[PDB]
């Protein structure tokens, strides 16, 4: 499992905005808060990336389990880069999975 | 895949000189949302895109230039994969 892209992003949540550090690995998308703590993750095979233009320069990631998460990003170009990188990797992911508590620890440690 | 990921029967069902109402038939599989793209045919103009939920199978496109050829595409987005597009040309 390799790290392909990572960026600070602003997550839009109920009544607030949160600064997150987001990581695209070969098989999953990880959202962390700042030592790192995992807020959530989505396997790429369980993810759908949606462009959001209201608010502007935003995107929404939908998870197969019915949740979705919305982020502001720095530019339309970076937003398009994230979608393309995720698409390229989704073509190489076939199996959904769930990480154990320690697996997540090791995953967050690697960050 | 065992069924097509692509919508069928994309068509303009109503038009004014500056707006189009498009419709398509959904693929066999539940869609998270659709992407609609449109831009001037051959014109090296910026292509624009928007979404509609997978429960909808029509969309309105507005703000177009009259008498201009446009290429319109629709594709489906799914958990884990992106469908291939279906495309039409239409002159306002």
Numbering used by the authors:
A (entry chain A): 707 to 740, 750 to 769, 830 to 886
B (entry chain C): 1 to 92
What did the authors write?
The Bcr-Abl oncoprotein is expressed from the Philadelphia (Ph) chromosome, which is formed upon the t(9;22) reciprocal chromosomal translocation that fuses the breakpoint cluster region (BCR) gene with the Abelson tyrosine kinase (ABL1). Bcr-Abl is a constitutively active tyrosine kinase and is selectively inhibited by imatinib (Gleevec), which became a paradigm for targeted cancer therapy.
Homology modeling indicated the presence of a unique insertion of 59 amino acids (residues 770–829) between predicted strands β5 and β6 constituting almost a third of the entire Bcr-Abl PH domain. Since the presence of such a large, putatively flexible element can dramatically interfere with any structure determination approaches, we deleted this part of the PH domain. In contrast, crystals of PHΔ770–829 in complex with the same monobody diffracted up to 1.65 Å and allowed structure determination of this complex. In addition, our construct further includes a C-terminal helical linker that was required for the stability of the PH domain. Based on our biochemical data, the PH domain forms a 1:1 complex with the monobody, which binds to the β4–β5 loop and the αC helix of the PH domain via its variable FG loop. In the Bcr-Abl PH structure residues K724 and R726 in the β1–β2 hairpin, in addition to K739 and K754 in the β3–β4 hairpin may qualify for the PIP-binding interface. This density partially fits the PI(4,5)P2 headgroup, although minor sterical clashes remain with the surrounding residues.
